[PDB]
Amino acid sequence: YHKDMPLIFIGGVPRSGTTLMRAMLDAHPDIRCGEETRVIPRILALKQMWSRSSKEKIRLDEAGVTDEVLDSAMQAFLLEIIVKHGEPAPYLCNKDPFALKSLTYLSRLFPNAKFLLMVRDGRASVHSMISRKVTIAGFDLNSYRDCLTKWNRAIETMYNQCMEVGYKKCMLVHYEQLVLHPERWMRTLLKFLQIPWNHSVLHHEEMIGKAGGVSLSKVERSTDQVIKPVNVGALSKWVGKIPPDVLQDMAVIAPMLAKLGYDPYANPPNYGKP
Amino acid sequence: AYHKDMPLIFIGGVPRSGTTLMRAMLDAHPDIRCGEETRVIPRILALKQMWSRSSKEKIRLDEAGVTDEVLDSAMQAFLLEIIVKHGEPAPYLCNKDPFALKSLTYLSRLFPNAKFLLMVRDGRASVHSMISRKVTIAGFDLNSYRDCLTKWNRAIETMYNQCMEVGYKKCMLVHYEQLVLHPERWMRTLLKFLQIPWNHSVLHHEEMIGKAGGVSLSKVERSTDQVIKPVNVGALSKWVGKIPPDVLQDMAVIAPMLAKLGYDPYANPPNYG
Amino acid sequence: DFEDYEFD
Amino acid sequence: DFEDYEFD
Ligand SMILES: Nc1ncnc2c1ncn2[C@@H]1O[C@H](COP(=O)(O)O)[C@@H](OP(=O)(O)O)[C@H]1O
Ligand SMILES: Nc1ncnc2c1ncn2[C@@H]1O[C@H](COP(=O)(O)O)[C@@H](OP(=O)(O)O)[C@H]1O
Ligand SMILES: [Mg+2]
Ligand SMILES: [Mg+2]
Ligand SMILES: [Zn+2]
């Protein structure tokens, strides 16, 4: 292992099919993602703060803790976590949703890394986190308005970075399109990753707990969903759940809906209409 | 060459306790490099400590495969990149970030051949220093001698206990006032502890400022303008008369670590000599 | 003390 | 937005 090894980073706002995505990849005999590390987004966030401060960057540079030094330390830490927290495989992968808040930075550290940004209708992601009580620091789960505002901010940052690095380095994966057309999207995605096809990605539920298959954490919130085959049962559970003031203001609260192909006045969009 | 079994030196203590002096005196030695405060080392150590201290979080990490073994490997890797690459090469590498010694015992686990130097200075002196010079520490209220002494007490209690936990073969307590009054005595003892040959240049560190194999200083570190001077006795008791009488009254109660570390909490000042 | 995720 | 030191 080294900083030129091929790496796959999956992320997105939580409740956007990120666990499903990583499980479908884990079902491939030559790919290992594994569980959420939790620590990767925390160290990335710390590092970003040091960069969001000119005064601090000056102090660090005058201490010899330059970008070259920090980048070497970050590469070493991240590789140890990625490599050592799970089983070996030809193609290693990490899924921590908010790691992609540092997508451009990770792309600079790891020139052979590729990125999969999961996109789901923000109304679905928000209803999911509120109804299931999946906690996110900075999101008020008693407010659909707050959660949609924060969803919008988070996905805007991640989307802009995905586009910044470009289509050869980052692919947008729409959750609703994945579950509606799994072979179509997995074919495209594996070609983007430059990894040969394996049919097992279409029956990931059969690789749960198997050698070279899907390892699930009993304390992760998506585990009881990802044990099921790929299904379309979670497309529109949000419909009728959002207060009417938030429905009225939807396009203003969450302009990223329209930008990502979701009609902010459709309840719901017909996700599969060609 | 560098690796987690190499013989590292970690200097720390509460800020304003002679930690920059200590590292500069060692930097004056031809075979030792400490260099500037890294700033990031105490921050990543603090993050890690918060993970492993929450029982609920440790369970989540273990179930993700992010065990102590994995975390320790990652921490070793990060810390060595910073220590090695932020300064000049030397046979004996050193790191000085005052609060890194809040993770003294953990560091001694990660780096089994590391040794530790815990600087101890009269809390009244350290507190007056931070307040008078406005050296900011998250968690310390510089408007309050009482708060600052309370926080000094808590911080040095943790670091002292860890020094005593690892024991005399791994940690040496260095009293600032003793060092400035008797530097040949203390530097000889300290270099014997580190198993590094004596060098007289450690008593004339002022001559090694900005020199190759010598003392590299940051223009934005708060102790730089003091450490450019030779080792002196001018800062022993600047605090005397500067502390509110209500804080003097309650000194033993606010700061029981004073008496524990040999400083009379009713002496203004102790006879450090 | 930790949540499922952190958005900074 | 960073202090000289942090206690933690
Ligand atoms: N086998 C499967 N088929 C379809 N969707 C799935 C799935 N496994 C997980 N998901 C969906 O992924 C969502 C959580 O995403 P993440 O892992 O990014 O938090 C859940 O949405 P709901 O909570 O709306 O049911 C869940 O239903
Ligand atoms: N050459 C020297 N001789 C004696 N003390 C020195 C020194 N250089 C630095 N110090 C002392 O170290 C203290 C700062 O410690 P640190 O580096 O741990 O923050 C300062 O105390 P004062 O601020 O009371 O003067 C400073 O005077
Ligand atoms: Mg696999
Ligand atoms: Mg030297
Ligand atoms: Zn001299």
Residue numbers in the entry:
A (entry chain A): 65 to 338
B (entry chain B): 64 to 336
C (entry chain D), D (entry chain E): 1002 to 1009
What is written in the article reporting this PDB entry?
Tyrosylprotein sulfotransferases (TPSTs) are enzymes that catalyse the transfer of a sulfonate moiety from 3′-phosphoadenosine-5′-phosphosulfate (PAPS) to the hydroxyl group of a tyrosine residue to form a tyrosine O-sulfate ester and 3′-phosphoadenosine-5′-phosphate (PAP). TPSTs are integral membrane glycoproteins located in the trans-Golgi network. In humans, two TPST isoforms, termed TPST1 and TPST2, have been identified. The human TPST1 catalytic domain comprises a single α/β motif with a five-stranded parallel β-sheet, flanked on both sides by α helices, and this structure is consistent with human TPST2 structure.
The asymmetric unit of human TPST1-PAP-C4P5Y5 contains two human TPST1 molecules, which assemble to form a dimer. In the human TPST1-PAP-C4P5Y5 complex, eight residues (D−4, F−3, E−2, D−1, Y°, E+1, F+2, D+3) out of the eleven residues of C4P5Y5 were defined in the electron density map, suggesting that human TPST1 binds strongly to C4P5Y5. The human TPST1 recognizes C4P5Y5 in a manner similar to that of human TPST2. Structural comparison of human TPST1-PAP-C4P5Y5 with human TPST2-PAP-C4P5Y3 yields an r.m.s.d. of only 0.814 Å for 272 Cαs, suggesting that the two structures are very similar. Furthermore, the positions of the catalytic residues R79, E100, K159 and S286 in human TPST1 are almost identical to those of the catalytic residues R78, E99, K158 and S285 in human TPST2, suggesting that the catalytic mechanism of human TPST1 is basically same to that of human TPST2. F−3 in C4P5Y5 interacts with W114 of human TPST1 through a hydrophobic interaction. The calculated interaction energies of residues furthest from the −1 and 0 positions were high. These results suggest that human TPST1 recognizes strongly Y° and the acidic residue at the −1 position.
